[PDB]
């Protein structure tokens, strides 16, 4: 989550119906756009961010939210348009002994600006005494491990989170949804559309 992946999408066609097949029950919160109408209007570039977060901390992935994940690992701007997808992945990211590959920052001097990444590993001097890199007093490592286990509750289970962000630029749109087609009728007065040709 702290080192969240950033992916850029350009020059392709987007079918968002497949997105709904992931889980029988999952969140599909969308900001500034109705999910059922994503197939008609369309933009220039698409940014996708994916990571793993705790079950009860999925509520912090939203504009204007605050907490631990909101201002220390991943910050969403208030003027954000897009959708957030999160589904339970306990069967894939769990260890009976305990998973430890997922790290999150816990100590930082200040908050995080929207769409900002902090990968530093410097020790955090909470107090006034400079420890110069030893986990003594008021000096704790910013990163902590997510001890995922299959025996945990739904509030501690790992949720895979994918966020898509859209924007409009003066460059023409290239990444969007498919268009419709209806056979072909001959010798019959019919209204028609051909790539916007009335």
């Amino acid at each position, epitope marked *: 989550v702290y080192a969240w992946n950033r992916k850029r999408i350009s020059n392709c066609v987007a079918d968002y119906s497949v997105l709904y097949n992931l889980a029988p029950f999952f969140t599909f919160k969308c900001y500034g756009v109705s999910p059922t109408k994503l197939n008609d209007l369309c933009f220039t570039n698409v940014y996708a961010d994916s990571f793993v977060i705790r079950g009860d901390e999925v509520r912090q992935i939203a504009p204007g939210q605050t907490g631990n994940i909101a201002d220390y690992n991943y910050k969403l701007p208030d003027d954000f348009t897009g959708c957030v997808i999160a589904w339970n992945s306990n069967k894939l990211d769990s260890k009976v002994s305990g998973n430890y590959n997922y790290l999150y920052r*816990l100590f930082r001097k200040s908050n995080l600006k929207p769409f900002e990444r902090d990968i530093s590993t410097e020790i955090y001097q*909470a*107090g*006034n*005494k*400079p420890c110069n890199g*030893v*986990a*003594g*007093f*008021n000096c*704790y490592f910013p990163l*902590r491990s997510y001890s995922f286990r299959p025996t945990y509750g739904v509030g501690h289970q790992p949720y895979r989170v994918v966020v898509l962000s859209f924007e409009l630029l003066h460059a023409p749109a290239t990444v969007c949804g498919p268009k419709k087609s209806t056979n072909l009728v001959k010798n019959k007065c019919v209204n028609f559309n051909f790539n916007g040709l009335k």
Partner: antibody
Amino acid sequence: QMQLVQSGPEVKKPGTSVKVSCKASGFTFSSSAVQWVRQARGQHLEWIGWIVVGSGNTNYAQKFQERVTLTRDMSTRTAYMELSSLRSEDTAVYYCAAPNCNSTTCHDGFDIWGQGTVVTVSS
Amino acid sequence: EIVLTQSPGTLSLSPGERATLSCRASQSVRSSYLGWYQQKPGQAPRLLIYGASSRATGIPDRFSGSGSGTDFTLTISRLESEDFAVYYCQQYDNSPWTFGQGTKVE
């Protein structure tokens, strides 16, 4: 107001377990730390262990590392310590100490202290 | 792993004069990783000197530490009736934390 309120004295028997907690209020308890020490009547202080309130990392004394555990709850902002294998020489006053914090800069060293609990192990 | 010898065990001074307290460590300890505690008979200890040179909040100005290399010293520049109690000093380094034997002032 900054204060550390601890529970009351308890009396147990050898071979049982002892549980004591102290509540912290009046400051930023999310970035503090708590240490546990014991002291018999007329004896010198002895350190047991400490835990990070926001991390859970523990560091125990060499002697008691096999019979001490440290647990904290963020919801109740409470620090818990448990001692197993009670003996007749375990009768001492237990204290919990935490530094001062203002959510921006924490105090260096343990300044404030609790009231203390007297525990007696007898049969 | 860290030893802080304390001497003398007993002190006999009258108020209005200046006393001395010494906590001599066996190895090298950084000045920012030690603290001095004083408790009245039956009461919990309070922090007096942290950083070997800086007082705490509410500490009377009569107390002034020395902060040597490895052998810390605290000279009481002015004695009061409250100052007659037992004193303990603790090391805050990476080694397991130990307390001194304790110095009593009469």
